[PDB]
Design a protein around this ligand. Structure first.
Ligand code: 0L8
Ligand code: 0L8
Lengths: 11, 238, 235, 12
């Protein structure tokens, strides 16, 4: 659950 | 898969439209430079550049066709290369200078403010001259940046991989399409193609060197608490 | 004189390169297993040290390499020596999936890489590049062309003749592809796929250089005469 | 400076 992971997921 | 369905001219428009803007740094002309402020300027800029890079990657045809796990890996692997080729591109029309930002053009001397930064600057300056030497065009640059993204960590992860290799071929086609249209002969087309991709080897080299330099600055306590950047840095020393 | 390399035709370039190929050397014949961290690193550095001598003789037979000043020659070699040894390792390992053929008598699986700290990560990259070579059906003729490109390209920005020689090799590569019956589109695509591999060889080289320097610091492997100097080349 | 590399490049 990296920050990159999140920013990639978010629409 | 709209990706493998794009024509050469649509691929070009897709990539050109996804181009992130050129950002400004926090550079104050009156503030004396130190090793901490110069590293502070670059990391502060890069950190903001990373957000745009993540949103740009999503618009690169085929990228979102990959699992989140693959997307994360490709970006963790290519982020500094992408920042660097972006930096070299911006500095093309400024011989001897690296245009980190519109309000931040640095020369190698200014690079001595940071321990061991000058040799990285020298490599970026040389790559920038190379760009002038062959008159690299905007359309070709966007193709190179997308290639870096898709290629850098493509073997360090098998069907999702096959997908990537097909988009890569679509990009090679687009590069050919662009050259043929420019009037280049067949021989000239395959020679410039090689000249362009040979650049990626140099981009990868500077990236590895700058990643070591950055990690070293991080152990000197001169790199701010930029979570995204730091997280991108740590992914390189598993 | 002008460079006699530019007048060479595709076929003469190809045969000149295959003719320059260095020999394949053997490692120690001691069958003592398993290896320790030092014994492993010792076998590898002893081998590379000996290969570097033949690598140098090979470089001098690369069309257009001796037309460069001694200064440039030295520079190109110090910059690409590890990349060149590695693509050689990847090439020799192509027909042995999941294994690295460092020498005929030194065929290592990825597991044996664990014998050395931080070595397995490098082994995996070399193995993957190797499967990549195998899946593309890399030909020996294409291989010698690629290896020559590393030599001339890696330290070339660190400075027209060299760039004319690279174009020659690029033409030679397409010639080999047209000869293999590849369509125009397949030639360009394959040219791209092969060259993108050099980005990976470079990355592998950077990692292995750092890892090799590490070992040096721990004072383990006996760095040899030429290898040490080549290692030091990277400030 | 003195380099074995110089020796191998020149002695050939
Ligand atoms: O210390 C070595 C170093 C050198 C450079 Br040159 C950069 C840099 C590259 C491109 C860019 O657009 C901004 C900065 C960074 C860096 C990368 C991320 O944060 C800082 C680190
Ligand atoms: O420790 C990281 C490391 C990894 C490898 Br893989 C090699 C190596 C590469 C090609 C070859 O033909 C023999 C050895 C070396 C190394 C040892 C000496 O010179 C290079 C160092």
């Amino acid at each position: 659950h990296k920050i990159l992971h999140r920013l990639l997921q978010e629409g | 898969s709209l990706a493998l369905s794009l024509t050469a001219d649509q691929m070009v428009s897709a990539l050109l439209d996804a181009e992130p803007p050129i950002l400004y740094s926090e550079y104050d002309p009156t503030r004396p430079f130190s090793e901490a402020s110069m590293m502070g300027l670059l990391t502060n800029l890069a950190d903001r550049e990373l957000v745009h890079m993540i949103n740009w990657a999503k618009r690169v045809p085929g990228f979102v066709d990959l699992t989140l796990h693959d997307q994360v890996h490709l970006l963790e692997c290519a982020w500094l290369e992408i920042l660097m080729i972006g930096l070299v591109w911006r500095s093309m029309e400024h011989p001897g200078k690296l245009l980190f930002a519109p309000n931040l053009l640095l020369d190698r001397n200014q690079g001595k403010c940071v321990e061991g930064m000058v040799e990285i600057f020298d490599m970026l300056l040389a790559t920038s001259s190379r760009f002038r030497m062959m008159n690299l065009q905007g359309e070709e640059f966007v193709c190179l940046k997308s290639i870096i993204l898709l290629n850098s960590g493509v073997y360090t992860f098998l069907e999702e991989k096959d997908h990537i290799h097909r988009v890569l071929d679509k990009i090679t086609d687009t590069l050919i399409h662009l050259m043929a249209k420019a009037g280049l002969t067949l021989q000239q087309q395959h020679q410039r193609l090689a000249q362009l991709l040979l650049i990626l080897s140099h981009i990868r080299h500077m990236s590895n060197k700058g990643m070591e330099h950055l990690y070293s600055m991080k152990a000197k306590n001169v790199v701010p608490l930029y979570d995204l950047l730091l997280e991108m840095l740590d992914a390189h020393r598993l």
